[PDB]
Design a protein around this ligand. Structure first.
Ligand SMILES: CCN1CC2(C1)CN(c1ccc(Nc3ncc(F)c(-c4cnn5c4[C@H](C)CCCC5)n3)nc1)C2
Length: 269
């Protein structure tokens, strides 16, 4: 065999990720993701999703994890190995937290890799610090995308089950943006209705025209009254970071800022 697994990195709905030894490339560390596929025979939606992943590899974007090899048997993906994710970085950073300019750089690399995905019509749909990898040199690399439970980073339209477009990932970016300063999740709910309730306690109840129609939860189901200043939960944030954070934490996904427009925000000057 060409690879040799040495440890398990994690398992879940994505599959099972292993830390492996690239026996034919000098023994470098790699990440093997095995995923079973119900053959009949392989589903066309899975074959098409792999072609998009190899096409996205041709660009070799620095803010997405590298795809080295693809093997078949039921489906093994060989990615470059990153030593830690975002949670491990936030847990190990000394006091009083992440440097202010380090947050700006990591948020910029996050938006670059996300804009690269949205430019090719790819929605991450599950952006969270657990799948945001931090290179030993400090680079941000996105992982676990393109292949089809914490609700703390779900967009309001996902909790309401209405729309699932690219603004879904920008809401998660806002939740991660606040967690940069807080080093603890901003909206930490225990259910679908609980997560949406703690969201509306901060950003306030949106207008009746902003609430999606033909959803189970109506606007009257929540009495969250008014909004609160964001600097109460996210201390040490500046004016430019506050304006960018609020444009990501917009209820209406149509009024939410895009990853492309977020790259040109005055916060990155
Ligand atoms: C406290 C103990 N916990 C175990 C853990 C902290 C070690 N900490 C971690 C994460 C990623 C990697 N390294 C890596 N390198 C390349 C990759 F491509 C991937 C990858 C690809 N897909 N996914 C992953 C990860 C398992 C993240 C979850 C989404 C699924 N991971 N090492 C360590 C998770």
């Amino acid at each position: 065999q060409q690879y040799e697994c040495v440890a398990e990195i994690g398992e879940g709905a994505y599959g099972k990720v292993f830390k492996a030894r690239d026996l034919k490339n000098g023994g470098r560390f790699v990440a093997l993701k095995r995923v079973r596929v119900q053959t009949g025979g392989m589903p066309l939606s899975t074959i098409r999703e792999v072609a998009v992943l190899r096409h996205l590899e041709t660009f070799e974007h620095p803010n997405v994890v590298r795809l080295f090899d693809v093997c078949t048997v039921k489906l093994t993906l060989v990615f470059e190995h990153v030593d830690q994710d975002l949670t491990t970085y936030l847990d190990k950073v000394p006091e009083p937290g992440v440097p202010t300019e380090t947050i700006k750089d990591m948020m910029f690399q996050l938006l670059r890799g996300l804009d690269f995905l949205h430019s090719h019509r790819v929605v991450h749909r599950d952006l969270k610090p657990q799948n945001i990898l931090v290179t030993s040199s400090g680079q941000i690399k996105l992982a676990d995308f393109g292949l089809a439970v914490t609700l703390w980073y779900r967009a309001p339209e996902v909790l309401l089950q209405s729309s699932y477009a690219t603004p879904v990932d920008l809401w998660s970016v806002g939740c991660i943006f606040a967690e940069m300063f807080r080093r603890k999740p901003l909206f930490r709910g225990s259910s679908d209705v609980d997560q949406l309730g703690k969201i509306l306690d901060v950003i306030g109840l949106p207008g009746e025209e902003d609430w999606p129609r033909d959803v189970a939860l109506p606007r009257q189901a929540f009495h969250s009254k008014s909004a609160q200043p964001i600097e109460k939960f996210v201390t040490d944030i500046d004016e430019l970071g506050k304006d960018l954070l609020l444009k990501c934490l917009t209820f209406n996904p149509a009024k939410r800022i895009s990853a492309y427009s977020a790259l040109s925000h005055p916060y990155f000057q």
